[PDB]
Design a protein around this motif. Structure first.
Motif, PDB file in Angstrom:
ATOM      1  N   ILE A 158     -24.697  -2.558   1.949  1.00  0.00           N
ATOM      2  CA  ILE A 158     -24.102  -3.883   1.878  1.00  0.00           C
ATOM      3  C   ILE A 158     -24.958  -4.804   1.021  1.00  0.00           C
ATOM      4  O   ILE A 158     -24.448  -5.491   0.128  1.00  0.00           O
ATOM      5  CB  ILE A 158     -23.922  -4.449   3.295  1.00  0.00           C
ATOM      6  CG1 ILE A 158     -22.738  -3.792   3.990  1.00  0.00           C
ATOM      7  CG2 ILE A 158     -23.739  -5.948   3.247  1.00  0.00           C
ATOM      8  CD1 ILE A 158     -22.709  -4.047   5.463  1.00  0.00           C
ATOM      9  N   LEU A 159     -26.270  -4.839   1.284  1.00  0.00           N
ATOM     10  CA  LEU A 159     -27.132  -5.772   0.555  1.00  0.00           C
ATOM     11  C   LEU A 159     -27.272  -5.409  -0.918  1.00  0.00           C
ATOM     12  O   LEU A 159     -27.585  -6.285  -1.734  1.00  0.00           O
ATOM     13  CB  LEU A 159     -28.504  -5.836   1.225  1.00  0.00           C
ATOM     14  CG  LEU A 159     -28.457  -6.299   2.683  1.00  0.00           C
ATOM     15  CD1 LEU A 159     -29.833  -6.110   3.338  1.00  0.00           C
ATOM     16  CD2 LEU A 159     -28.004  -7.737   2.785  1.00  0.00           C
ATOM     17  N   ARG A 160     -27.028  -4.154  -1.274  1.00  0.00           N
ATOM     18  CA  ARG A 160     -27.102  -3.746  -2.667  1.00  0.00           C
ATOM     19  C   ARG A 160     -25.766  -3.855  -3.392  1.00  0.00           C
ATOM     20  O   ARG A 160     -25.712  -3.616  -4.604  1.00  0.00           O
ATOM     21  CB  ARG A 160     -27.633  -2.317  -2.765  1.00  0.00           C
ATOM     22  CG  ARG A 160     -29.150  -2.235  -2.672  1.00  0.00           C
ATOM     23  CD  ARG A 160     -29.616  -0.796  -2.500  1.00  0.00           C
ATOM     24  NE  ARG A 160     -31.039  -0.711  -2.180  1.00  0.00           N
ATOM     25  CZ  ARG A 160     -31.611   0.344  -1.610  1.00  0.00           C
ATOM     26  NH1 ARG A 160     -30.884   1.408  -1.304  1.00  0.00           N
ATOM     27  NH2 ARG A 160     -32.915   0.341  -1.351  1.00  0.00           N
ATOM     28  N   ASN A 161     -24.700  -4.256  -2.705  1.00  0.00           N
ATOM     29  CA  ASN A 161     -23.367  -4.290  -3.296  1.00  0.00           C
ATOM     30  C   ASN A 161     -22.983  -5.721  -3.644  1.00  0.00           C
ATOM     31  O   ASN A 161     -22.964  -6.592  -2.767  1.00  0.00           O
ATOM     32  CB  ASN A 161     -22.346  -3.681  -2.338  1.00  0.00           C
ATOM     33  CG  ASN A 161     -20.970  -3.596  -2.941  1.00  0.00           C
ATOM     34  OD1 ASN A 161     -20.306  -4.612  -3.147  1.00  0.00           O
ATOM     35  ND2 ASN A 161     -20.529  -2.379  -3.231  1.00  0.00           N
ATOM     36  N   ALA A 162     -22.635  -5.948  -4.918  1.00  0.00           N
ATOM     37  CA  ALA A 162     -22.358  -7.296  -5.404  1.00  0.00           C
ATOM     38  C   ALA A 162     -21.145  -7.929  -4.738  1.00  0.00           C
ATOM     39  O   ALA A 162     -21.044  -9.158  -4.707  1.00  0.00           O
ATOM     40  CB  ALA A 162     -22.153  -7.290  -6.923  1.00  0.00           C
ATOM     41  N   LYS A 163     -20.210  -7.130  -4.244  1.00  0.00           N
ATOM     42  CA  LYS A 163     -19.052  -7.686  -3.560  1.00  0.00           C
ATOM     43  C   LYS A 163     -19.294  -7.891  -2.076  1.00  0.00           C
ATOM     44  O   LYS A 163     -18.790  -8.866  -1.505  1.00  0.00           O
ATOM     45  CB  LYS A 163     -17.828  -6.789  -3.758  1.00  0.00           C
ATOM     46  CG  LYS A 163     -16.974  -7.168  -4.967  1.00  0.00           C
ATOM     47  CD  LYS A 163     -16.046  -6.028  -5.379  1.00  0.00           C
ATOM     48  CE  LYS A 163     -14.579  -6.423  -5.260  1.00  0.00           C
ATOM     49  NZ  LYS A 163     -14.167  -6.631  -3.843  1.00  0.00           N
ATOM     50  N   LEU A 164     -20.086  -7.025  -1.448  1.00  0.00           N
ATOM     51  CA  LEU A 164     -20.282  -7.128  -0.007  1.00  0.00           C
ATOM     52  C   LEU A 164     -21.376  -8.120   0.362  1.00  0.00           C
ATOM     53  O   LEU A 164     -21.260  -8.811   1.383  1.00  0.00           O
ATOM     54  CB  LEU A 164     -20.612  -5.751   0.576  1.00  0.00           C
ATOM     55  CG  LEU A 164     -19.470  -4.740   0.436  1.00  0.00           C
ATOM     56  CD1 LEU A 164     -19.859  -3.388   1.025  1.00  0.00           C
ATOM     57  CD2 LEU A 164     -18.197  -5.293   1.104  1.00  0.00           C
ATOM     58  N   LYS A 165     -22.446  -8.197  -0.437  1.00  0.00           N
ATOM     59  CA  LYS A 165     -23.575  -9.040  -0.052  1.00  0.00           C
ATOM     60  C   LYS A 165     -23.202 -10.509   0.125  1.00  0.00           C
ATOM     61  O   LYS A 165     -23.591 -11.091   1.148  1.00  0.00           O
ATOM     62  CB  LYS A 165     -24.726  -8.898  -1.054  1.00  0.00           C
ATOM     63  CG  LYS A 165     -25.927  -9.752  -0.636  1.00  0.00           C
ATOM     64  CD  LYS A 165     -27.156  -9.515  -1.486  1.00  0.00           C
ATOM     65  CE  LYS A 165     -28.387 -10.157  -0.850  1.00  0.00           C
ATOM     66  NZ  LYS A 165     -28.306 -11.640  -0.787  1.00  0.00           N
ATOM     67  N   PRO A 166     -22.453 -11.158  -0.782  1.00  0.00           N
ATOM     68  CA  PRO A 166     -22.099 -12.569  -0.518  1.00  0.00           C
ATOM     69  C   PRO A 166     -21.347 -12.756   0.788  1.00  0.00           C
ATOM     70  O   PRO A 166     -21.571 -13.742   1.504  1.00  0.00           O
ATOM     71  CB  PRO A 166     -21.227 -12.956  -1.719  1.00  0.00           C
ATOM     72  CG  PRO A 166     -21.458 -11.906  -2.752  1.00  0.00           C
ATOM     73  CD  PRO A 166     -21.877 -10.661  -2.042  1.00  0.00           C
ATOM     74  N   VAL A 167     -20.434 -11.832   1.111  1.00  0.00           N
ATOM     75  CA  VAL A 167     -19.677 -11.933   2.352  1.00  0.00           C
ATOM     76  C   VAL A 167     -20.602 -11.772   3.557  1.00  0.00           C
ATOM     77  O   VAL A 167     -20.580 -12.579   4.495  1.00  0.00           O
ATOM     78  CB  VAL A 167     -18.543 -10.890   2.360  1.00  0.00           C
ATOM     79  CG1 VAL A 167     -17.721 -11.030   3.625  1.00  0.00           C
ATOM     80  CG2 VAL A 167     -17.674 -11.076   1.134  1.00  0.00           C
ATOM     81  N   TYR A 168     -21.434 -10.732   3.537  1.00  0.00           N
ATOM     82  CA  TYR A 168     -22.394 -10.499   4.603  1.00  0.00           C
ATOM     83  C   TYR A 168     -23.257 -11.727   4.835  1.00  0.00           C
ATOM     84  O   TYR A 168     -23.432 -12.171   5.977  1.00  0.00           O
ATOM     85  CB  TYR A 168     -23.269  -9.295   4.240  1.00  0.00           C
ATOM     86  CG  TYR A 168     -24.185  -8.840   5.341  1.00  0.00           C
ATOM     87  CD1 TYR A 168     -25.517  -9.248   5.387  1.00  0.00           C
ATOM     88  CD2 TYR A 168     -23.719  -7.999   6.338  1.00  0.00           C
ATOM     89  CE1 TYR A 168     -26.358  -8.817   6.411  1.00  0.00           C
ATOM     90  CE2 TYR A 168     -24.540  -7.565   7.350  1.00  0.00           C
ATOM     91  CZ  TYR A 168     -25.853  -7.973   7.390  1.00  0.00           C
ATOM     92  OH  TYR A 168     -26.638  -7.522   8.424  1.00  0.00           O
ATOM     93  N   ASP A 169     -23.801 -12.293   3.752  1.00  0.00           N
ATOM     94  CA  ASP A 169     -24.708 -13.425   3.904  1.00  0.00           C
ATOM     95  C   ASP A 169     -23.989 -14.644   4.446  1.00  0.00           C
ATOM     96  O   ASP A 169     -24.607 -15.478   5.114  1.00  0.00           O
ATOM     97  CB  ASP A 169     -25.360 -13.790   2.577  1.00  0.00           C
ATOM     98  CG  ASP A 169     -26.408 -12.805   2.154  1.00  0.00           C
ATOM     99  OD1 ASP A 169     -26.865 -12.906   0.999  1.00  0.00           O
ATOM    100  OD2 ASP A 169     -26.768 -11.935   2.975  1.00  0.00           O
ATOM    101  N   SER A 170     -22.691 -14.780   4.159  1.00  0.00           N
ATOM    102  CA  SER A 170     -21.967 -15.946   4.639  1.00  0.00           C
ATOM    103  C   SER A 170     -21.629 -15.866   6.120  1.00  0.00           C
ATOM    104  O   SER A 170     -21.284 -16.891   6.723  1.00  0.00           O
ATOM    105  CB  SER A 170     -20.675 -16.121   3.844  1.00  0.00           C
ATOM    106  OG  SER A 170     -19.677 -15.223   4.304  1.00  0.00           O
ATOM    107  N   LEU A 171     -21.708 -14.679   6.715  1.00  0.00           N
ATOM    108  CA  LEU A 171     -21.233 -14.461   8.072  1.00  0.00           C
ATOM    109  C   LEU A 171     -22.334 -14.720   9.097  1.00  0.00           C
ATOM    110  O   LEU A 171     -23.531 -14.631   8.806  1.00  0.00           O
ATOM    111  CB  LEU A 171     -20.725 -13.025   8.240  1.00  0.00           C
ATOM    112  CG  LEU A 171     -19.445 -12.635   7.479  1.00  0.00           C
ATOM    113  CD1 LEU A 171     -19.275 -11.116   7.555  1.00  0.00           C
ATOM    114  CD2 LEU A 171     -18.215 -13.344   8.035  1.00  0.00           C
ATOM    115  N   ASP A 172     -21.896 -15.017  10.314  1.00  0.00           N
ATOM    116  CA  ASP A 172     -22.731 -15.027  11.504  1.00  0.00           C
ATOM    117  C   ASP A 172     -23.072 -13.601  11.941  1.00  0.00           C
ATOM    118  O   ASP A 172     -22.521 -12.616  11.446  1.00  0.00           O
ATOM    119  CB  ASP A 172     -21.988 -15.730  12.625  1.00  0.00           C
ATOM    120  CG  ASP A 172     -20.677 -15.042  12.919  1.00  0.00           C
ATOM    121  OD1 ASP A 172     -20.652 -14.181  13.831  1.00  0.00           O
ATOM    122  OD2 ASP A 172     -19.695 -15.326  12.190  1.00  0.00           O
TER     123      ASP A 172
END
Length: 162
Positions: A78-92
């Motif tokens: 997730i943290l290495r994926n340009a599409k998943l990381k912004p979503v992950y970071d935005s979440l609780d």
């Protein structure tokens, strides 16, 4: 409740090589061994993953070791994926576990293709995201698990796992 207990609920534990919901050889706590139809290919992968001649059987400690590695891999993916990381970071934290759960089940690339759902999650349009997530092969093939994960995205609670 945490991501490990959540995935233990969704994945179970089996110490002998078995076939997953898609017919693929698997062991332990949802550890995909191979998509090859060869059980020998799967046994070879298993021995490679454990570091010994297992002949298709592992211990509980061994299953938990692969599981720790697989959860780790899902988060790093997730943290290495340009599409998943912004979503992950935005979440609780609870909804982050739901995303890790999805990546654990279907892989970094598969989840990153949920473009419209990811946008809705990023926008915190929870009910809309939940509706969009269910319009998927994922939901139709594993609906009870998908419902639990979707409920976790919708509510930001662990209600579906208690």
């Amino acid at each position: 409740m945490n991501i490990f207990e959540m995935l233990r609920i969704d994945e179970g534990l089996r110490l002998k090589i078995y076939k997953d919901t898609e017919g693929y050889y698997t062991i332990g706590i949802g550890h995909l061994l191979t998509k090859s139809p060869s059980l020998n290919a799967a046994k070879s992968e298993l021995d490679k993953a454990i570091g010994r001649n297992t002949n298709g059987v592992i211990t509980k400690d061994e299953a938990e070791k692969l599981f720790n590695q697989d959860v780790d891999a899902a988060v790093r993916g997730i943290l290495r994926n340009a599409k998943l990381k912004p979503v992950y970071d935005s979440l609780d934290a609870v909804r982050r576990a739901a995303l890790i759960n999805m990546v654990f089940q279907m892989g970094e690339t598969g989840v990153a293709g949920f473009t419209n759902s990811l946008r809705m999650l990023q926008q915190k349009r929870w009910d809309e995201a939940a509706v969009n997530l269910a319009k998927s092969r994922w939901y139709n093939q594993t609906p009870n698990r998908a419902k639990r994960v979707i409920t976790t995205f919708r509510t930001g609670t662990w209600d579906a796992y208690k």
